Amino acid sequence: MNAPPAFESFLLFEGEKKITINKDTKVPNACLFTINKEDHTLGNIIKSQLLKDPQVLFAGYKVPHPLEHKIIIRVQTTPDYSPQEAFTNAITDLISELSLLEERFRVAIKDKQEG
Amino acid sequence: QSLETRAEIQELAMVPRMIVTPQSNRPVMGIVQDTLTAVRKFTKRDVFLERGEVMNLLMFLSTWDGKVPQPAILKPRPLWTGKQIFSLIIPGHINCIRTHSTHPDDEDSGPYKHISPGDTKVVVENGELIMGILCKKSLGTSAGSLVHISY
Amino acid sequence: KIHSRARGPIQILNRQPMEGRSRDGGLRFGEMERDCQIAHGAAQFLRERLFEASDPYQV
Amino acid sequence: MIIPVRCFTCGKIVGNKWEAYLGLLQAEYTEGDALDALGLKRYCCRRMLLAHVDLIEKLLNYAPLEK
Amino acid sequence: PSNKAFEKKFRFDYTNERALRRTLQEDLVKDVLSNAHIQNELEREFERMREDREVLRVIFPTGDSKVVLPCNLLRMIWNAQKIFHINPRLPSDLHPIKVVEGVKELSKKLVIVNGDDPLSRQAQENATLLFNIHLRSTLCSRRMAEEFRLSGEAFDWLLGEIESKFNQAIAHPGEMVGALAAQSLGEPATQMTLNAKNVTLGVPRLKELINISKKPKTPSLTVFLLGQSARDAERAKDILCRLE
Amino acid sequence: DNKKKIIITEDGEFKALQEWILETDGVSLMRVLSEKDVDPVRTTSNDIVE
Amino acid sequence: PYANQPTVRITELTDENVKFIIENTDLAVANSIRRVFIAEVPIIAIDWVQIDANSSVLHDEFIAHRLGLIPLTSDDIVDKLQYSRDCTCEEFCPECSVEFTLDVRCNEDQTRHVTSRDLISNSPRVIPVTSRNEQDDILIVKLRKGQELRLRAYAKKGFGKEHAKWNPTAGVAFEYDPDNALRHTVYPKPEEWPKSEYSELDEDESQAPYDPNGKPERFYYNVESCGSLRPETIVLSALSGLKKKLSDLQTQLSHEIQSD
Amino acid sequence: QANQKRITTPYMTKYERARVLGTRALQIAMCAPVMVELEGETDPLLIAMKELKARKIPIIIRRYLPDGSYEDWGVDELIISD
Amino acid sequence: AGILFEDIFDVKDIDPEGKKFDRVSRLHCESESFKMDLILDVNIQIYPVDLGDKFRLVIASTLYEDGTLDDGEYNPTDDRPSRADQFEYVMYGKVYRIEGDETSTEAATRLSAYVSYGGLLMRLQGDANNLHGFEVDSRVYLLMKKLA
Ligand SMILES: [Zn+2]
Ligand SMILES: [Zn+2]
C-alpha cells in the first residue's frame, strides 16, 4: 500500500540535485552539504578524512531520517581555507587511497595464487 | 478543515503548550526509556568524548551556535565530557538543583556536600551542567525538574 | 488497519459517516473527546467536528 | 514448508543442504557433525537446517488438481 | 523557625556597625545608622512580618511549609545573581529602604481583584495574602543584604519578573475549569488500586464521596482526647469503653 | 504527624505531641462529641453525611 | 592533510572465502568497504518471472521470490551488462538481462526435485552456482506425479540496497583490535571472555593494556562469498564501486561549485 | 457599560488570541486588505500572527459579563503575553 | 601572567571513600609551600597517578604566557605561546562556589574554592591570602605536571 520502491534509495529523481551547498550563517567559513541518495557509507569516510585535515575545525555527518536516503555533512575550516576545497581534497585523498589499496590487493591475490 | 480551527489548535492544544499540566503543576511528558538510561550513563564523571564523536553529536543539535566548547581536558589528549555537551543542550541560563536516585542522605550533612564523590547533587548554573548525574528526578515528569524549569 | 476518510459515504437514518473500513466509515469523536476539547476551550474545533464534518443540515 | 534458499541472517545458500543433511542423519550422524560436514559453522545457518520442518513432503500426499 | 531565629534571621540589625560595613557599602551604612525614619521603616517591616507569621500559624497548624505559589522567588533571585554577576563576598549597594518600598509597590501591582471599594480591597488583600507573605519573607531587607546580596539593578529586574510571571499565572477568562477538574480527578482514578483497622481507599472511597452514600463500607471516627486522657492509656481506655 | 497534636511552644517552635487517639467502626458525632475528655475541635469523621 | 598508505596481507584465499588484513587506514574506510561488500557490489539475479503453468503446491510468488535468491555466476558478465535504468532498450534485451527458461513435469511416481540444474539460460557464462562445474544443486520445488512447472525468467544487474538477492556475500567477519587496547569495549569481567582468533596474548592475560595514543588499525576481514562472485572479485568490484561513487560525487561537486 | 472604567483584565486571553488569529486569517484568506508589511509570507496564519505582534489588527473583542453587560476591548488596547 | 595559584602538592590518598568510577579517580593532596589541602578528580586512564607522587599545580585563567583573555572556544589551529606545552595534564573548568569561615563581622581567613572541569570537581581550601584571584563564574585551567 505504501512500500516505497527499493531503487528509490539510489536513483536520483528528475530535477533533483545530487548535492546542494548551503552556507551556514552562525559561524564563518562553514557550509552544509546535503547529498541525496546516499547513506553512512560515504558520510563516515569523508568525515574521517576531513578530521585529519588540520585546517578543518568541524567535520561531521548526519542522517535526518533513516527512511530517507539523503545525508547532511557540515564542514568548518579556517579563514585561509575553504570548506568546499576540503570536501574535494577529502574525496581526492580517498580515491588515491582506494586506488593504492586496489593495486596492492591484486598483487597480494597474485602472490597468493602463485605461492 | 478551517483556518480558524487551524489557528485555534496552533495556540491552545499544541504539544509545547501542553507540556505542563494544571492537574499537578508538573510536566506530564519527559525523557523516556532509552534517552533516560543513556543520559544517565552519559553525564557520569567517567564519560569522555573524542574530537570525532563530539562532532557527530553536535551535528544533531538544532540549538547550536556552531562554536565547539573548550574541552575539560586539553592534554595529553583533547577530551570533552558528557556534561560539557549537555550544557549546550540545556537552553538559556536556567538554574536548578536536584539529587540523583542514589544520593545518600549522609552526604549533605558531612563534608563533600558541594563536591559529591558519586557525582550526585545535580547543579545547573547559567545553563551549564556543573555536576551531577541526571535521571528521572532531574528530567522525568517530577516537579522542579530541568524541563519544568525550562517551560 | 490503516484507515482514512474524506467526504465519504454516510448512513441513511442519520446523515453521518459510516462505520468500518469496509464501508469507508469515519472515526468516532466520542464524548470523552468532546470533554477534552472543552477543557482546551476549543469551541470552533468542537463545532467543526460535531456539526460541519459529521452532519451539517439546514431547516 | 520447504527448505529456504539463503539464510535470513547471513545469506549463505542452504537450499542445497537439506537433502544432504537428511542423507547424513540416516547414516547415523549427529545433527552437529552433519552440519559441520556441510560447511555450516555460524549458528545462524545451523538454525535453518536444524529448525526447518519439511511440510511440502506432506502437501505432496494430496492428489493434484489436474492429472 | 522559632521567635529567636525568626528575629535573628529577618530583623535588620542597624546597631552592629561592623556587620553592615561588610554587607553594605560606606554610603548605605552611614545612612542606616544616622537616619532614624529608616530604622522605623525596617522595624515596621519586621512587625508586619511578625503579624504574617501568626497568620500562617493559624492557617497552617501543622509544620508543613510546602506551599504552591505562582512564582519561585529563590530561583528568580538565583537567576539575577548570574545575570548581573553578583559577588556574595563583596558589600552590596542595595539600600534596604528600596527593598521595602519596592515590595510594597509590587504587592499593589499584583491585582487579583480590580476595585478600590473596601469589599474588593479585602478580597485582593486576602487573595494575594499567602503570596505577599512569602514575598515579604523572601525579599526581606536583611536577607537581601547577607544572604542574596543583590544590587540595585538586579532587584529592579526581579520585581519586573515577579509582576510579569504573576500576571501570566492568572486564570484566563473562559477557561473551562470544570472539566479541567473532572479530568484531573478522573485521570488518577485509572491508576489507583481498586481494593490497625480496614479503611476503604481508591475508587470505592472516591466513589462513595461523589455519590454521597448513607451507608458507607468503612465509616469511622477520629476521636481526640483533651487532657490527661490524651497522655495516659488507663484513662483513654475508660473513654474507649464509654463509646464502644 | 497528620494526627498528632501540633502545638506552638513558648519559643515559637512546632512540637508534635504523641497523644492517644481512638478510631471507631461507626459514626455518631452528636453523641461522641458530647462526651467528657473528648476534643470538640479536632474530632471529625469520614462520613460526610453525618 | 592527505591519504594513508595502507597495506594488505592475505592469510587465506579459496573459492568460497578470502581472509585478508588491512593496515594503516581509518576505521571509516574499513567499515564502508565492509558495507560495500554487501550493499554496493553489482551482481546478476532473477528480477522478473512469468509463470506459464504451475500445478505445484507452492503459488507463483513463492517460486518467483525463491528464484531470485539463486546465485548466478557473474564474475565477468556483470561488468559488461548495464542497468535497465540506463539501457536504451525495451523492457528486456541481451545487454541488460539474461533470459532463463524452465520446463519440468513429474511423469513418474517418484517425487521430482525441481533444482537449479533445470534453469536453462541463453548465456553460458551466467549460470547457477551449483551448476558450475561436492556441492549439490539448489532445491526450488518438489513435484508430484501429474504436476508441472513452466516459466520464463529474466535476470538483471543490481546491488544489495535494492534487494538481498543481489548480496554476493554470505558473511563478512569484520574485526579490529582483537586485544582490547583502545578500550572501545569495557569487559566487566575480562577473564570470562574468550580470545579472538587474531589475538596475540598469553592465556594468563585477558586483554592488552590501554593505549592512549592508539588508533584503530590492522582491520581483519573474511569475505565468504555466496558463490556468484569469487571472494577476490567482490573486493575489487567493491573498491572500484566505492571509488566510482566518490568520482561521480566529485563531478557533481565541481558542477555545483562552478555554478555558485 | 462605562468604557472609561473597564474591570475586565487588560491582557488578551489565550482563547481571545486564538479566535483573533483565526478570524483574521480567514479575512486574509478572502483577499482582505493587509495592515502591515510582508516579506515573503503567503499563509494567512503567518500574516495574522505578525499583525498581532505589530498590534495592527482591526478587530474588537466584545467581552460579555455574567450580569449581561459587555466590554468592547480592541486588539490594540489589550496586552499580548504569549 | 594570568596565574591565580601555584604550588607543589603531594598525593596523600586516592579514593578514600572507595572507587566509584573507572576512568576517574579522586586525589587527596596537600602542599608544603602554603599548606593547602586539595581534592581533585583526574582521568587516571590517560594520566595515571600513584600514591605518594608529587606534581606541580598552576591554576591559571589563560594558557597564553602573556596576559590575554581566552574565548572559551576550541581552536587547535593556534600557534601562540601557551604554557600548556610545559605541562602534561591540563583541564578547563569554572568556579561555582567559594566557601569560607567568615562571620557576621569578621572577614574570611580560610577559603575553599570549588571548580568543575566539565564534571571533574576540584576543591582547593587553605589560606585566603592565596585564593584572592578566585571568583565565581570564572574560567580557569589546571596545568598539572608530575615531577620527581
Ligand atoms: Zn546464516
Ligand atoms: Zn537492456
PDB file of N, CA, C and O in Angstrom, chain E residues 177-228:
ATOM      1  N   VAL E 177     -12.639  25.402  33.775  1.00  0.00           N
ATOM      2  CA  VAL E 177     -12.036  24.779  34.947  1.00  0.00           C
ATOM      3  C   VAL E 177     -12.847  23.606  35.474  1.00  0.00           C
ATOM      4  O   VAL E 177     -12.333  22.820  36.276  1.00  0.00           O
ATOM      5  N   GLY E 178     -14.100  23.468  35.047  1.00  0.00           N
ATOM      6  CA  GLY E 178     -14.925  22.362  35.485  1.00  0.00           C
ATOM      7  C   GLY E 178     -14.435  21.036  34.945  1.00  0.00           C
ATOM      8  O   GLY E 178     -14.000  20.168  35.708  1.00  0.00           O
ATOM      9  N   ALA E 179     -14.504  20.864  33.622  1.00  0.00           N
ATOM     10  CA  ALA E 179     -13.971  19.653  33.012  1.00  0.00           C
ATOM     11  C   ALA E 179     -12.493  19.485  33.324  1.00  0.00           C
ATOM     12  O   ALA E 179     -12.015  18.356  33.486  1.00  0.00           O
ATOM     13  N   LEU E 180     -11.756  20.593  33.414  1.00  0.00           N
ATOM     14  CA  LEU E 180     -10.345  20.518  33.773  1.00  0.00           C
ATOM     15  C   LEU E 180     -10.158  19.856  35.132  1.00  0.00           C
ATOM     16  O   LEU E 180      -9.139  19.200  35.378  1.00  0.00           O
ATOM     17  N   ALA E 181     -11.133  20.018  36.027  1.00  0.00           N
ATOM     18  CA  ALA E 181     -11.041  19.404  37.347  1.00  0.00           C
ATOM     19  C   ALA E 181     -11.514  17.956  37.323  1.00  0.00           C
ATOM     20  O   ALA E 181     -10.919  17.096  37.983  1.00  0.00           O
ATOM     21  N   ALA E 182     -12.577  17.668  36.571  1.00  0.00           N
ATOM     22  CA  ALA E 182     -13.072  16.298  36.493  1.00  0.00           C
ATOM     23  C   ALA E 182     -12.051  15.382  35.832  1.00  0.00           C
ATOM     24  O   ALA E 182     -11.886  14.228  36.244  1.00  0.00           O
ATOM     25  N   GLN E 183     -11.358  15.877  34.806  1.00  0.00           N
ATOM     26  CA  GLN E 183     -10.330  15.072  34.156  1.00  0.00           C
ATOM     27  C   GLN E 183      -9.120  14.891  35.063  1.00  0.00           C
ATOM     28  O   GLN E 183      -8.551  13.797  35.138  1.00  0.00           O
ATOM     29  N   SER E 184      -8.714  15.953  35.764  1.00  0.00           N
ATOM     30  CA  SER E 184      -7.600  15.848  36.697  1.00  0.00           C
ATOM     31  C   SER E 184      -7.911  14.914  37.857  1.00  0.00           C
ATOM     32  O   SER E 184      -6.983  14.361  38.456  1.00  0.00           O
ATOM     33  N   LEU E 185      -9.188  14.731  38.188  1.00  0.00           N
ATOM     34  CA  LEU E 185      -9.584  13.809  39.243  1.00  0.00           C
ATOM     35  C   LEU E 185      -9.948  12.429  38.715  1.00  0.00           C
ATOM     36  O   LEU E 185      -9.923  11.461  39.483  1.00  0.00           O
ATOM     37  N   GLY E 186     -10.285  12.317  37.433  1.00  0.00           N
ATOM     38  CA  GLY E 186     -10.613  11.035  36.845  1.00  0.00           C
ATOM     39  C   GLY E 186      -9.399  10.342  36.264  1.00  0.00           C
ATOM     40  O   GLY E 186      -9.355   9.110  36.187  1.00  0.00           O
ATOM     41  N   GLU E 187      -8.405  11.126  35.849  1.00  0.00           N
ATOM     42  CA  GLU E 187      -7.174  10.540  35.329  1.00  0.00           C
ATOM     43  C   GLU E 187      -6.471   9.674  36.364  1.00  0.00           C
ATOM     44  O   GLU E 187      -6.182   8.503  36.064  1.00  0.00           O
ATOM     45  N   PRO E 188      -6.170  10.157  37.574  1.00  0.00           N
ATOM     46  CA  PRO E 188      -5.540   9.274  38.568  1.00  0.00           C
ATOM     47  C   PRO E 188      -6.437   8.138  39.020  1.00  0.00           C
ATOM     48  O   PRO E 188      -5.929   7.150  39.564  1.00  0.00           O
ATOM     49  N   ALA E 189      -7.752   8.244  38.813  1.00  0.00           N
ATOM     50  CA  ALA E 189      -8.647   7.161  39.204  1.00  0.00           C
ATOM     51  C   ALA E 189      -8.349   5.885  38.431  1.00  0.00           C
ATOM     52  O   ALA E 189      -8.637   4.784  38.915  1.00  0.00           O
ATOM     53  N   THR E 190      -7.775   6.008  37.234  1.00  0.00           N
ATOM     54  CA  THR E 190      -7.432   4.844  36.428  1.00  0.00           C
ATOM     55  C   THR E 190      -6.148   4.167  36.884  1.00  0.00           C
ATOM     56  O   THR E 190      -5.894   3.026  36.483  1.00  0.00           O
ATOM     57  N   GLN E 191      -5.337   4.833  37.706  1.00  0.00           N
ATOM     58  CA  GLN E 191      -4.086   4.268  38.193  1.00  0.00           C
ATOM     59  C   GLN E 191      -4.185   3.724  39.610  1.00  0.00           C
ATOM     60  O   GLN E 191      -3.467   2.779  39.949  1.00  0.00           O
ATOM     61  N   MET E 192      -5.053   4.294  40.441  1.00  0.00           N
ATOM     62  CA  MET E 192      -5.179   3.842  41.817  1.00  0.00           C
ATOM     63  C   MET E 192      -5.715   2.414  41.867  1.00  0.00           C
ATOM     64  O   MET E 192      -6.302   1.904  40.910  1.00  0.00           O
ATOM     65  N   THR E 193      -5.505   1.770  43.011  1.00  0.00           N
ATOM     66  CA  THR E 193      -5.944   0.397  43.200  1.00  0.00           C
ATOM     67  C   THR E 193      -7.447   0.341  43.443  1.00  0.00           C
ATOM     68  O   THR E 193      -8.039   1.249  44.033  1.00  0.00           O
ATOM     69  N   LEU E 194      -8.064  -0.746  42.979  1.00  0.00           N
ATOM     70  CA  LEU E 194      -9.498  -0.929  43.170  1.00  0.00           C
ATOM     71  C   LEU E 194      -9.832  -1.359  44.591  1.00  0.00           C
ATOM     72  O   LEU E 194     -10.874  -0.961  45.125  1.00  0.00           O
ATOM     73  N   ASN E 195      -8.974  -2.161  45.214  1.00  0.00           N
ATOM     74  CA  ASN E 195      -9.205  -2.636  46.573  1.00  0.00           C
ATOM     75  C   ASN E 195      -8.055  -2.233  47.489  1.00  0.00           C
ATOM     76  O   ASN E 195      -6.892  -2.241  47.084  1.00  0.00           O
ATOM     77  N   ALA E 196      -4.001  -0.952  61.371  1.00  0.00           N
ATOM     78  CA  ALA E 196      -4.878  -1.144  62.519  1.00  0.00           C
ATOM     79  C   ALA E 196      -6.248  -1.646  62.073  1.00  0.00           C
ATOM     80  O   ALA E 196      -6.577  -2.818  62.251  1.00  0.00           O
ATOM     81  N   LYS E 197      -7.039  -0.750  61.490  1.00  0.00           N
ATOM     82  CA  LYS E 197      -8.376  -1.063  61.012  1.00  0.00           C
ATOM     83  C   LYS E 197      -8.406  -1.050  59.490  1.00  0.00           C
ATOM     84  O   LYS E 197      -7.546  -0.457  58.831  1.00  0.00           O
ATOM     85  N   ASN E 198      -9.415  -1.716  58.935  1.00  0.00           N
ATOM     86  CA  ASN E 198      -9.604  -1.754  57.490  1.00  0.00           C
ATOM     87  C   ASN E 198     -10.343  -0.498  57.045  1.00  0.00           C
ATOM     88  O   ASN E 198     -11.450  -0.220  57.520  1.00  0.00           O
ATOM     89  N   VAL E 199      -9.731   0.260  56.139  1.00  0.00           N
ATOM     90  CA  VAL E 199     -10.297   1.501  55.627  1.00  0.00           C
ATOM     91  C   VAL E 199     -10.428   1.388  54.117  1.00  0.00           C
ATOM     92  O   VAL E 199      -9.537   0.857  53.444  1.00  0.00           O
ATOM     93  N   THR E 200     -11.540   1.888  53.586  1.00  0.00           N
ATOM     94  CA  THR E 200     -11.778   1.861  52.150  1.00  0.00           C
ATOM     95  C   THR E 200     -10.970   2.959  51.470  1.00  0.00           C
ATOM     96  O   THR E 200     -11.017   4.122  51.881  1.00  0.00           O
ATOM     97  N   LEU E 201     -10.230   2.584  50.430  1.00  0.00           N
ATOM     98  CA  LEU E 201      -9.392   3.521  49.697  1.00  0.00           C
ATOM     99  C   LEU E 201      -9.500   3.231  48.208  1.00  0.00           C
ATOM    100  O   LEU E 201      -9.949   2.161  47.791  1.00  0.00           O
ATOM    101  N   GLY E 202      -9.079   4.205  47.406  1.00  0.00           N
ATOM    102  CA  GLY E 202      -9.087   4.055  45.966  1.00  0.00           C
ATOM    103  C   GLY E 202     -10.393   4.482  45.331  1.00  0.00           C
ATOM    104  O   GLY E 202     -11.054   5.408  45.813  1.00  0.00           O
ATOM    105  N   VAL E 203     -10.774   3.811  44.243  1.00  0.00           N
ATOM    106  CA  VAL E 203     -12.016   4.164  43.558  1.00  0.00           C
ATOM    107  C   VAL E 203     -13.231   3.984  44.462  1.00  0.00           C
ATOM    108  O   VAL E 203     -14.076   4.888  44.506  1.00  0.00           O
ATOM    109  N   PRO E 204     -13.382   2.872  45.186  1.00  0.00           N
ATOM    110  CA  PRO E 204     -14.549   2.746  46.077  1.00  0.00           C
ATOM    111  C   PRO E 204     -14.706   3.914  47.035  1.00  0.00           C
ATOM    112  O   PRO E 204     -15.824   4.408  47.225  1.00  0.00           O
ATOM    113  N   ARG E 205     -13.610   4.373  47.644  1.00  0.00           N
ATOM    114  CA  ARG E 205     -13.694   5.540  48.513  1.00  0.00           C
ATOM    115  C   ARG E 205     -13.940   6.811  47.713  1.00  0.00           C
ATOM    116  O   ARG E 205     -14.678   7.693  48.164  1.00  0.00           O
ATOM    117  N   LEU E 206     -13.336   6.924  46.528  1.00  0.00           N
ATOM    118  CA  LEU E 206     -13.612   8.072  45.671  1.00  0.00           C
ATOM    119  C   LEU E 206     -15.056   8.054  45.191  1.00  0.00           C
ATOM    120  O   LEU E 206     -15.686   9.109  45.055  1.00  0.00           O
ATOM    121  N   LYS E 207     -15.595   6.863  44.928  1.00  0.00           N
ATOM    122  CA  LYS E 207     -16.985   6.752  44.501  1.00  0.00           C
ATOM    123  C   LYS E 207     -17.925   7.271  45.581  1.00  0.00           C
ATOM    124  O   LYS E 207     -18.636   8.262  45.380  1.00  0.00           O
ATOM    125  N   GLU E 208     -17.918   6.624  46.750  1.00  0.00           N
ATOM    126  CA  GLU E 208     -18.863   6.963  47.811  1.00  0.00           C
ATOM    127  C   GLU E 208     -18.920   8.460  48.080  1.00  0.00           C
ATOM    128  O   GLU E 208     -19.948   8.968  48.543  1.00  0.00           O
ATOM    129  N   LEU E 209     -17.836   9.182  47.801  1.00  0.00           N
ATOM    130  CA  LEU E 209     -17.826  10.621  48.038  1.00  0.00           C
ATOM    131  C   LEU E 209     -18.606  11.366  46.960  1.00  0.00           C
ATOM    132  O   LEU E 209     -19.448  12.216  47.270  1.00  0.00           O
ATOM    133  N   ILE E 210     -18.340  11.063  45.689  1.00  0.00           N
ATOM    134  CA  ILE E 210     -19.016  11.774  44.609  1.00  0.00           C
ATOM    135  C   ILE E 210     -20.510  11.472  44.621  1.00  0.00           C
ATOM    136  O   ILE E 210     -21.334  12.352  44.344  1.00  0.00           O
ATOM    137  N   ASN E 211     -20.885  10.235  44.938  1.00  0.00           N
ATOM    138  CA  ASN E 211     -22.284   9.854  45.120  1.00  0.00           C
ATOM    139  C   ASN E 211     -22.476   9.590  46.611  1.00  0.00           C
ATOM    140  O   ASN E 211     -22.272   8.476  47.096  1.00  0.00           O
ATOM    141  N   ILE E 212     -22.875  10.632  47.337  1.00  0.00           N
ATOM    142  CA  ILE E 212     -22.980  10.572  48.790  1.00  0.00           C
ATOM    143  C   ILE E 212     -23.828   9.371  49.181  1.00  0.00           C
ATOM    144  O   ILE E 212     -25.010   9.285  48.826  1.00  0.00           O
ATOM    145  N   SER E 213     -23.228   8.439  49.915  1.00  0.00           N
ATOM    146  CA  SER E 213     -23.892   7.212  50.331  1.00  0.00           C
ATOM    147  C   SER E 213     -24.234   7.295  51.811  1.00  0.00           C
ATOM    148  O   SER E 213     -23.403   7.715  52.624  1.00  0.00           O
ATOM    149  N   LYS E 214     -25.456   6.892  52.155  1.00  0.00           N
ATOM    150  CA  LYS E 214     -25.898   6.903  53.542  1.00  0.00           C
ATOM    151  C   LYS E 214     -25.419   5.687  54.323  1.00  0.00           C
ATOM    152  O   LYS E 214     -25.625   5.635  55.540  1.00  0.00           O
ATOM    153  N   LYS E 215     -24.791   4.717  53.661  1.00  0.00           N
ATOM    154  CA  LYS E 215     -24.284   3.509  54.313  1.00  0.00           C
ATOM    155  C   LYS E 215     -22.920   3.170  53.728  1.00  0.00           C
ATOM    156  O   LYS E 215     -22.773   2.214  52.957  1.00  0.00           O
ATOM    157  N   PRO E 216     -21.892   3.944  54.073  1.00  0.00           N
ATOM    158  CA  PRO E 216     -20.544   3.646  53.577  1.00  0.00           C
ATOM    159  C   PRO E 216     -20.094   2.253  53.992  1.00  0.00           C
ATOM    160  O   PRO E 216     -20.715   1.576  54.813  1.00  0.00           O
ATOM    161  N   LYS E 217     -18.976   1.825  53.402  1.00  0.00           N
ATOM    162  CA  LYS E 217     -18.461   0.488  53.672  1.00  0.00           C
ATOM    163  C   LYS E 217     -17.626   0.453  54.946  1.00  0.00           C
ATOM    164  O   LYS E 217     -17.710  -0.509  55.718  1.00  0.00           O
ATOM    165  N   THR E 218     -16.820   1.486  55.184  1.00  0.00           N
ATOM    166  CA  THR E 218     -15.935   1.555  56.346  1.00  0.00           C
ATOM    167  C   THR E 218     -16.027   2.942  56.968  1.00  0.00           C
ATOM    168  O   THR E 218     -15.081   3.735  56.899  1.00  0.00           O
ATOM    169  N   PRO E 219     -17.161   3.268  57.585  1.00  0.00           N
ATOM    170  CA  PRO E 219     -17.268   4.543  58.300  1.00  0.00           C
ATOM    171  C   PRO E 219     -16.554   4.477  59.640  1.00  0.00           C
ATOM    172  O   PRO E 219     -16.628   3.477  60.357  1.00  0.00           O
ATOM    173  N   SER E 220     -15.852   5.557  59.973  1.00  0.00           N
ATOM    174  CA  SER E 220     -15.045   5.585  61.183  1.00  0.00           C
ATOM    175  C   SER E 220     -14.924   7.014  61.685  1.00  0.00           C
ATOM    176  O   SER E 220     -15.118   7.977  60.939  1.00  0.00           O
ATOM    177  N   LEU E 221     -14.599   7.134  62.967  1.00  0.00           N
ATOM    178  CA  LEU E 221     -14.382   8.414  63.624  1.00  0.00           C
ATOM    179  C   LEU E 221     -12.898   8.612  63.900  1.00  0.00           C
ATOM    180  O   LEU E 221     -12.093   7.680  63.830  1.00  0.00           O
ATOM    181  N   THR E 222     -12.543   9.856  64.220  1.00  0.00           N
ATOM    182  CA  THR E 222     -11.186  10.227  64.621  1.00  0.00           C
ATOM    183  C   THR E 222     -11.315  10.975  65.945  1.00  0.00           C
ATOM    184  O   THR E 222     -11.402  12.205  65.969  1.00  0.00           O
ATOM    185  N   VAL E 223     -11.325  10.228  67.043  1.00  0.00           N
ATOM    186  CA  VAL E 223     -11.553  10.791  68.369  1.00  0.00           C
ATOM    187  C   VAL E 223     -10.233  11.301  68.927  1.00  0.00           C
ATOM    188  O   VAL E 223      -9.238  10.566  68.970  1.00  0.00           O
ATOM    189  N   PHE E 224     -10.225  12.558  69.358  1.00  0.00           N
ATOM    190  CA  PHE E 224      -9.074  13.169  70.005  1.00  0.00           C
ATOM    191  C   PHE E 224      -9.416  13.485  71.455  1.00  0.00           C
ATOM    192  O   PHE E 224     -10.502  13.991  71.749  1.00  0.00           O
ATOM    193  N   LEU E 225      -8.486  13.184  72.353  1.00  0.00           N
ATOM    194  CA  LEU E 225      -8.683  13.422  73.774  1.00  0.00           C
ATOM    195  C   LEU E 225      -8.153  14.799  74.163  1.00  0.00           C
ATOM    196  O   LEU E 225      -7.311  15.387  73.479  1.00  0.00           O
ATOM    197  N   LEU E 226      -8.662  15.312  75.283  1.00  0.00           N
ATOM    198  CA  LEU E 226      -8.392  16.688  75.690  1.00  0.00           C
ATOM    199  C   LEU E 226      -7.207  16.790  76.649  1.00  0.00           C
ATOM    200  O   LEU E 226      -6.207  17.446  76.340  1.00  0.00           O
ATOM    201  N   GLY E 227      -7.305  16.146  77.809  1.00  0.00           N
ATOM    202  CA  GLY E 227      -6.328  16.341  78.863  1.00  0.00           C
ATOM    203  C   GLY E 227      -5.502  15.117  79.189  1.00  0.00           C
ATOM    204  O   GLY E 227      -4.900  14.506  78.300  1.00  0.00           O
ATOM    205  N   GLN E 228      -5.462  14.752  80.474  1.00  0.00           N
ATOM    206  CA  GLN E 228      -4.633  13.635  80.908  1.00  0.00           C
ATOM    207  C   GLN E 228      -4.947  12.363  80.133  1.00  0.00           C
ATOM    208  O   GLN E 228      -4.057  11.534  79.911  1.00  0.00           O
TER     209      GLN E 228
END
